[PDB]
Amino acid sequence: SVKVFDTKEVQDLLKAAANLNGDAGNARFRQIVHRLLSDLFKAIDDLDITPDEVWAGVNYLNKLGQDGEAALLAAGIGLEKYLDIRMDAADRAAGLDGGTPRTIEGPLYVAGAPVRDGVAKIDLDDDADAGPLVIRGTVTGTDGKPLAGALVECWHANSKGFYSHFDPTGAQTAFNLRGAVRTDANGKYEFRTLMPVGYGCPPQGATQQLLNGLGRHGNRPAHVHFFVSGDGHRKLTTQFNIEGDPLIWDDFAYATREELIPHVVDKTGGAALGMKSDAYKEIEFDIVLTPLLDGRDNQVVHRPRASADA
Amino acid sequence: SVKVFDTKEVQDLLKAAANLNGDAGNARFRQIVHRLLSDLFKAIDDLDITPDEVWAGVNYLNKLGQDGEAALLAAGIGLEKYLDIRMDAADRAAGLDGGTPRTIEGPLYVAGAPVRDGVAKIDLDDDADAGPLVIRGTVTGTDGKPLAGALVECWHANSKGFYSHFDPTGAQTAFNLRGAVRTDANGKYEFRTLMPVGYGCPPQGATQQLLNGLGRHGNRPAHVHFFVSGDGHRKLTTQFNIEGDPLIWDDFAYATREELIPHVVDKTGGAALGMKSDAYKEIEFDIVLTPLLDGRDNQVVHRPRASADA
Ligand SMILES: [Zn+2]
Ligand SMILES: [Zn+2]
Description:
The structure is a homodimer of 310-residue chains. The longest helix of chain A has 21 residues, at 27-47. Chain A has a single domain (2-308), classed as Aromatic compound dioxygenase (Protocatechuate 3,4-Dioxygenase, subunit A), CATH 2.60.130. Chain A has helices spanning 8-17, 27-47, 51-66, 70-76, 79-93, 206-214, and strands at residues 110-111, 115-117, 119-121, 132-141, 151-156, 178-182, 188-194, 223-229, 236-241, 264-267, 280-284, 287-289, 306-307. Chain A is 25% helix and 20% strand. In chain A, strand 8 and strand 9 form a beta hairpin. The first copy, chain A, starts with 7 loop residues before the first helix and ends with a strand. The first copy, chain A, is of the alpha/beta class. The first copy, chain A, is globular and about 75 Å long. In chain A, strands 3, 4, 7, 10, 11 and 12 form a six-stranded mixed sheet that branches. In chain A, strands 2-6-5-8-9 form a five-stranded mixed sheet, with no helix packed on it. The interface between A and B is large, with 76 and 76 residues.
């Protein structure tokens, strides 16, 4: 067995490849690339990764991008959760850890949903196998005061586990099961929707291929995603899990938090809300936002996101 | 900046994501994934890589695979050269460092070229801007005796810097500038071709995008690729560079070696050889192969490769 990482030839190659001694340029980017390349080269050296293994990994990266799944893989190997862990640690160090917990966004947000006042009905497509669901709650700040005019956005899957704009069967209308509500004067919001079923990775796709190699499933428990925002407060990325889903603590993207599992309550009187049956389920999901730090939101995330027109 | 990498929560997440403790999955694959993931998480912690930075990297991985350029990036950030450095070290440790030096294959080999005995004309398409070139040499073993019936394959670019089967203009015939010759009884091979000009990355592609961010060019000096094989000997991947190219020691893929820069000789008498002018250039490139180690070729590489019919 041979080791070459700590040799002058290898260190010169890394310096050249990242252009550390180049003209003035993007020093931060060169610093990051040098670190990632150095770590990769050292891992190849330490584990004696063969050329055949490396070229299989290179081939995998081609498939990953061809499938458009790099952000799904980021969820599946815990990187997305890891970013939340680092934001959580920064919040604890600054006393901003008293609100509704964050969790991962996932890769399926779509911008452009219509904003309603107080109540939105977001099931645009018929879904016979999904029962009616009312999600409602109150938004407050950590101080305790309800927040009027706060913007509550949600998105979730249908009974086949698919999201609109990402449904491979093409069966969904634009913005089905996606919507936004401005809270009323008492901080209240309400979504009228249908019950989600859990998501699973595209079985032929790159993420599931890698999970298969690891001996891992690619499934998520049923859940609903949220963005919540409002004047004077930081933007919350969160979700809640559907109580009783047996995958709730075995999510392939590691998103579950014990504070984010509200009760599912059987109700009647559905016709008064325009639901499709008298019997329906209600989930009360109250949300607590944190104030800005020095007038700034130190944890909002910019990433590529889909958009569409109504 | 927070430091969370060493915490139990993060170490547990890494063990889960790579399924180190599961019964299922490929053991070697889980080990490699855990190492790469652990190193990535530590780098993010150490350099305080922001979520915005991480998601830009994720987006880049999508573009890289969409462009089909993972193998081109592997050459461009020195990973392909690095594999050669590790193979060279193994050969030194085993006493097998006495042949013509290896260099990188690159991503543009195509299997299927018609095999000729002794001499092959490989410029099938006219190319007015490239002058005539003869490449000839003798294949020997490390003992200095000629190897008869050894297979010498070469491939190189036209005057526009493009290879057949990878020419985005579609202008080249199958196997243009791609040869395969079996050496004669005296070990000799000869190719009659045109002079290559250097390759450059697809300018809108992912590899050049990353190089642009580093402040690096994506150009190669003019060169000719070789595979050389023969019974009882290991398969050699190598190249030679055209003497005098201004980029000869500034290859973006770091492939140049001092032993692989043969002298270019001005000749006359081209018409008798079937060349398009009386004056032509000649390059003598002798090749030394190494015998098998314990009956096996311990350095042959299996990677995805194109193929075509003549
Ligand atoms: Zn989801
Ligand atoms: Zn080349």
